[PDB]
Design a protein around this ligand. Structure first.
Ligand SMILES: [Cl-]
Ligand SMILES: [Cl-]
Ligand SMILES: [Cl-]
Ligand SMILES: [Cl-]
Lengths: 222, 222
């Protein structure tokens, strides 16, 4: 119910955006994900990075238009609506999850911890988390509470909708080139093909810029 | 907008539900729908009927569990969550519609009126509206404001999710037999094959009870 409270407040785009990004931190994945755990965790991580990349490109913390409750500029009004919609998406996912916990038995309520990931997925996950931590202006934000995604549909919906919403966000601002360069910089630290191939597969359908940067880099060996 | 403010209140399942049903009333469809206008309108109508049928079956206005702000029975808690989620869905739809109006040309913003409907579609639409109007508790609710669906995906989202949520609603309550008898009563005034054919097509995928009730009628005269 926290995302709902945030949307009910008087934040500008920047405050709403920073709450969107922080929403990703304490989502857990149910044991149901099985062997798809790593890719699904990374698709969540990628959706987050995508959001962080836009904020960076648009200089969210330095553009005064993003700091008012009532923006005038159409692009910024669009951005505000989109970022509110992302929060509503997390709110609704938390509701679905709550309905599941109400009816399920203890066996179906087991979740993965970060240590459960394969070593390569684990390492990409750390790299993707740290990358947005650098970008994210430091937390005034109150801590959020942990909750779990228990089925694939729920995760797909977040990851797919966030990605579409960032597409809309990028469309509204003159940041086409900046975002592609940023995607290139994000990936300069991963050298081995194994990690690049896992990244490109998880980025499929949700981050064309990361997918292109990874596909181009795998040729710097093959 | 309004749906968010409704969810932010202190209503019980009954108040929230009645607001869900009232949300359908002032949805407009943009001229984009073309030949598909009639069917898409009826699919919205059917999702509304679907919702009203559950309320009638469960005696939404008479069962006092549906009046508490903090219900105790798990099934009623489930119902409250779903009904809140339907309101959130309408609120996102309105946000998407506002983003469209902010950027669209004047010609892109023309909407159908009910009188633009072809005769058999028109008649079926009056019928479905009349049916839920007499089911619905006399409105003390404040009047909501008109807004438009400008593309098919926005409409499909509402129709598919509401149908899916009424499924979850029906599972939470011992009302299997009741909803079937109710679906039969809805269709026994419409007699012509041409109307039942168009009705059944529109009900496909979203209301199986109505689909069968229309199927037994067309088979009775063929
Ligand atoms: Cl702010
Ligand atoms: Cl502004
Ligand atoms: Cl879930
Ligand atoms: Cl109530």
């Amino acid at each position: 119910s926290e995302p709902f409270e945030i949307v009910a407040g008087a934040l500008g785009v920047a405050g709403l955006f920073n709450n969107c990004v922080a929403c990703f931190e304490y989502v857990q994945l149910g044991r149901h994900f099985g062997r798809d755990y790593e890719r699904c965790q990374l698709r969540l991580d990628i959706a987050k990075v995508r959001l962080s990349r836009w904020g960076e490109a648009v200089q969210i913390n330095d553009d005064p238009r993003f700091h008012s409750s009532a923006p005038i500029d159409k692009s910024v009004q669009l951005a505000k609506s989109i970022v509110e919609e992302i929060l509503l998406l997390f709110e609704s996912a938390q509701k679905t999850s709550k309905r599941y916990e109400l009816v399920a038995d203890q066996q179906d309520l087991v979740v993965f911890e970060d240590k459960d990931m394969k070593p390569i997925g684990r390492a990409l996950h750390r790299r993707l988390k740290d990358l947005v931590s650098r970008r994210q202006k430091q937390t005034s934000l109150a801590k959020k509470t942990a909750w779990a995604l228990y089925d694939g549909k729920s995760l797909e919906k977040i990851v797919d909708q966030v990605a579409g919403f960032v597409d809309e966000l990028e469309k509204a601002f003159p940041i086409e080139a900046v975002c592609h360069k940023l995607a290139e910089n994000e990936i300069e630290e991963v050298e081995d093909e194994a990690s690049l191939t896992i990244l490109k597969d998880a980025a499929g359908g949700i981050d064309a810029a990361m997918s292109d940067a990874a596909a181009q880099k795998i040729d710097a060996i093959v």
